[PDB]
Design a protein around this ligand. Structure first.
Ligand SMILES: CO[C@H]1O[C@H](CO)[C@@H](O)[C@H](O)[C@@H]1O
Ligand SMILES: CO[C@H]1O[C@H](CO)[C@@H](O)[C@H](O)[C@@H]1O
Ligand SMILES: CO[C@H]1O[C@H](CO)[C@@H](O)[C@H](O)[C@@H]1O
Ligand SMILES: CO[C@H]1O[C@H](CO)[C@@H](O)[C@H](O)[C@@H]1O
Ligand SMILES: [Ca+2]
Ligand SMILES: [Ca+2]
Ligand SMILES: [Ca+2]
Ligand SMILES: [Ca+2]
Ligand SMILES: [Ca+2]
Ligand SMILES: [Ca+2]
Ligand SMILES: [Ca+2]
Ligand SMILES: [Ca+2]
Lengths: 114, 114, 114, 114
């Protein structure tokens, strides 16, 4: 199944933050309406924040997280969770290797802000 | 029901990261085995990463998040989600006022690391 | 925080299923737009299905689950999860006693159907 | 990533319940410690509970859900959620066609029981 794709309310500001847990340098691209809106990269085996930004979901509401290492797309896992019918988390993990820890790049999207 | 309390695997490294979305300065306390292990603070209405830290879950694995605004405890909402039976997120939202957006301090705990 | 309240897409069919794990008979009310849409009653300490019903979210999209024993409201916990940006679960637990297992009546709402 | 596989605590009672939403007959097999422990079959486009059962996770705690339509495995999506650090749901969706509603067989595992 498709992973790392989320439908947000239109024209809504959301937060996106990425962490790294890998010997490989991670590249995280955040797409809004199929176009790269933010790119984060870095390397850490200690959950270092490799990027954070506030973006706008625009008129499509379509937000996609892609993770790549040495040009090769990582395998993604994702889900959305809503707390008290108000607070949204869109969560992404990724695997770049063979140990299947799925934490090599971790991405957290949250809304609403403000 | 109790919120912001999570049982992690014992003696395990986890990341804890806090975001602020309020006019009030937020104070986030992270307790490990009922003792304060980290404290983050900041003020933003634009999802500032007011703190992030790697901690060890200790002997019991009990991790608790508490949020306050100048000594006044905020109301908490929380859940844990596990992706591909491997990647864990413990999620916390909090409300310091009356608009019930529950984003005033958002806390994300993730494991495993490395 | 308010629990057991969910916003569904308008005019959408959804399934609601209730399980019992308590010595007390559980009374489960499902409200749609603040009015009774379904009521289940049953007792089991072995996860028996005490009700299942296909409902329509109608014009409001507001769905609320209430659980009580002899008219006294149980404490609720709830969250919504979305898989592959398509499949929705609205989940509810309830506690009618002191042991805090939160399973006394468990309610699962799922959509889309068909 | 692997989907539909969950590690439960060893020797724990759990409920498993399968719903059908497809023109095709669904077969749901539930494996514990790699051995079929329950099997449900049925066709519905109205969220019929094609089976529910109570099982024990045994010494391994390994539970796997498989879904097939006349001998072809459906594509699975899954996640586990925990509310108030106590109530667990292991959730499975599956797709047997092209529309990607991922509801063709839906399986919900819940614990604790009693
Ligand atoms: C050395 O192992 C680390 O780096 C590899 C990539 O080389 C990851 O897949 C693995 O999970 C570890 O984080
Ligand atoms: C002014 O409104 C903002 O600040 C208050 C606290 O004063 C929050 O509760 C609210 O959600 C907004 O973030
Ligand atoms: C006897 O214990 C059972 O019934 C009570 C209600 O009396 C529940 O609260 C409890 O979790 C058990 O299911
Ligand atoms: C006719 O459409 C229905 O049946 C097909 C399988 O034939 C499913 O994939 C689809 O989601 C619908 O439930
Ligand atoms: Ca890895
Ligand atoms: Ca890793
Ligand atoms: Ca608020
Ligand atoms: Ca706020
Ligand atoms: Ca109870
Ligand atoms: Ca009970
Ligand atoms: Ca389908
Ligand atoms: Ca279907």
């Amino acid at each position: 199944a498709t992973q790392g794709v989320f439908t947000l309310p239109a024209n809504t500001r959301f937060g996106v933050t990425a962490f790294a847990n890998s010997s490989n340098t991670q590249t995280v691209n955040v797409l809004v309406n199929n176009e790269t809106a933010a790119t984060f990269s870095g390397q850490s085996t200690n959950n270092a924040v490799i990027g954070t930004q506030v973006l706008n979901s625009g008129s499509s509401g379509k937000v996609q997280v892609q993770v790549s290492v040495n040009g090769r797309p990582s395998d993604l896992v994702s889900a959305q969770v809503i707390l008290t019918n108000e607070l949204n988390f869109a969560l992404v993990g990724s695997e770049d290797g063979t140990d299947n820890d799925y934490n090599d790049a971790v991405v957290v999207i949250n809304w609403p802000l403000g």
